[PDB]
């Protein structure tokens, strides 16, 4: 019922070879629609989902232009940050920026965000209220002050509560067939014998969307958190996702364990036991 | 749509 639009940007300095790598991606929920790669011949924001191809030349020239402006700011930032941390020019470093907005079931504005990281660590972030910033360390305090003097929060705040939401609404219209869809997982279970006295139960959940899913193992009606394996939800590569969970049980006790799943797709939350 | 024309320098 609730939707979102987010942009992820990555910039990495390549000290020994011209420009730094710059990658930008856009996402509506868990489905991607745009991309830009500094090292792509195109040097254009490109479509990555059929429902966005629709947009005319004014839209592409605008984003291309905007994303190029992004690629520049970051390029400058890597220099600025190299200085704030007083680092050598020999090693590579990474800046990451992520922003976007979430809308509710009514599709109105719920919240907006803008997070900025350095070398895989929080650097500065726009607070809940969208009027103030949070500085991870003293280096960001310099950017924090600079941004407040440049009234940078207002511009974002205007963007998030305004434009990103209004575009989020638009994209939600043009690609309904896919954006408002929900696919319950195709779930099953497997049993693999081990030791001739112990065994592994793996619980599977495939072809589901969105990517938000849950899996829990229970032992005689109690949550089994230890001795259980769980891998990060993985993409199928066709818009659907995949995820599993395993537990190690002593032999002859497989009926004590029950796998559980939660997902917008399933009308009722499932419960799975090993039958054959 | 992306934020623009450009973002602020850090």
């Amino acid at each position, epitope marked *: 019922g609730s939707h979102s639009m987010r942009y992820f940007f990555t910039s990495v300095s390549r000290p020994g070879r011209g420009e730094p790598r710059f990658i930008a991606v856009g996402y509506v929920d868990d489905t991607q629609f745009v991309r830009f790669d500094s090292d792509a011949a195109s040097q254009r924001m490109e479509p990555r989902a059929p429902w966005i191809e629709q947009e005319g030349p004014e839209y592409w*020239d605008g984003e291309t232009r905007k994303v190029k*402006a992004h690629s*520049q700011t970051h390029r400058v930032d890597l220099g600025t940050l190299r200085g704030y941390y007083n680092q050598s020019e020999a090693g590579s470093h990474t800046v990451q920026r992520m922003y976007g907005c979430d809308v509710g079931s009514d599709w109105r504005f719920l919240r907006g965000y803008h997070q900025y990281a350095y070398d895989g660590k929080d650097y500065i972030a726009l607070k809940e209220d969208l009027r103030s910033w949070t500085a991870a360390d003293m280096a960001a305090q310099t950017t924090k002050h600079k941004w407040e*003097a440049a009234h*940078v929060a*207002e511009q974002l705040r205007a963007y998030l509560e305004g434009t990103c939401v209004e575009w989020l609404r638009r994209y939600l219209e043009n690609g309904k067939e896919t954006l408002q869809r929900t696919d319950a997982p195709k779930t099953h279970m497997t049993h693999h014998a081990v030791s001739d006295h112990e065994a592994t139960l793996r619980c599977w959940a495939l072809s589901f969307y969105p990517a938000e899913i849950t899996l829990t193992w229970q032992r005689d009606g109690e949550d089994q958190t230890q001795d259980t394996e769980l891998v990060e939800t993985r993409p199928a590569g066709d818009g659907t996702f995949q995820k599993w969970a395993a537990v190690v049980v002593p032999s002859g006790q497989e009926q004590r364990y029950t796998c559980h799943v939660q997902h917008e797709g399933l009308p009722k939350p499932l419960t799975l036991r090993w039958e054959p | 749509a992306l934020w623009g*024309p450009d973002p602020a320098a850090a």
Partner: T-cell receptor
Amino acid sequence: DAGVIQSPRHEVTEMGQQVTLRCKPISGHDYLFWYRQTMMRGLELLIYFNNNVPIDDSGMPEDRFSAKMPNASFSTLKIQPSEPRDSAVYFCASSLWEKLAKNIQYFGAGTRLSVLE
Amino acid sequence: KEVEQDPGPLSVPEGAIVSLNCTYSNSAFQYFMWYRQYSRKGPELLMYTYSSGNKEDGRFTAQVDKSSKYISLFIRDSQPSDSATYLCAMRGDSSYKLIFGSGTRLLVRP
């Protein structure tokens, strides 16, 4: 009190030559804009820089026009070769990110360019 | 990317209220400002607005009806000193490139 400085303010010249219009932005500003105003067409943005790199030049005529900023405090608008249809008033402007967000631009005194056959 | 504005010249007697206005046909615009230009001199920013709304700033009042793609500037207690050419300008969030109107000449009689 030291604003944008364009140069020269008046230029009367004969076609088939290289006219050079200069502009010095307000020290501290890192966006520079070139505009022209022909009485019969109004204000047109020719081009604008950010940190010295041409960001938008859709306004530039396809050929015979060339702008550039070798440094933060100097931009050049060259027209070669001079033609009458190019005579007009050329303005320059500089500004900053916090100021542009409110569409504030500091304009120069302009340069009246008259090109004669 | 077109902006329409009547050139005037429009005359009004000192002390009256006069309305200037432009219209546009690109929904991408969301920044609207008004410049004032005296003959043989440069343009001076007067009012600026973002999206729809009415902004007061002393004797000036800027308005913008996004539904109608119509912008207006009101000048109260017109003074002969207000005589000049008025230009509107706008843009989107894609570039700092401003698009101007041909301008409306104003002449407030003393």
